[PDB]
Amino acid sequence: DSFVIRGDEVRQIAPGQTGKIADYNYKLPDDFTGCVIAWNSNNLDSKVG
């Protein structure tokens, strides 16, 4: 699964986590197994305007 979110929300992506994106956008099962990969994208996903 691939998507782009804000900087402070990288911690919210975990089982048994509560938040606006956690509740209304993306929810992880409590028994989730796997790995999580995230990286900054200022060089690609940033515009002066």
């Binding site: 089982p15 048994g16 509560t18 409590d30």
Partner: protein
């Protein structure tokens, strides 16, 4: 005082039952001794702890 033999059985049963009932009001290390309060004060990931 002739019937101590039959009184001892009743006393032992009542005292064992009383101890079993009274054992419910113990933290055992948890924050609170009632689980209804626990379920209504913390998120599940530590509520289960």
């Amino acid at each position: 005082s002739a019937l101590g033999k039959l009184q001892n059985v009743v006393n032992q049963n009542a005292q064992a039952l009383n101890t079993l009932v009274k054992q419910l009001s113990s933290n055992f290390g948890a924050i609170s001794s009632v689980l209804n309060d626990i379920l209504s004060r913390l998120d599940p990931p530590e509520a289960e702890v």
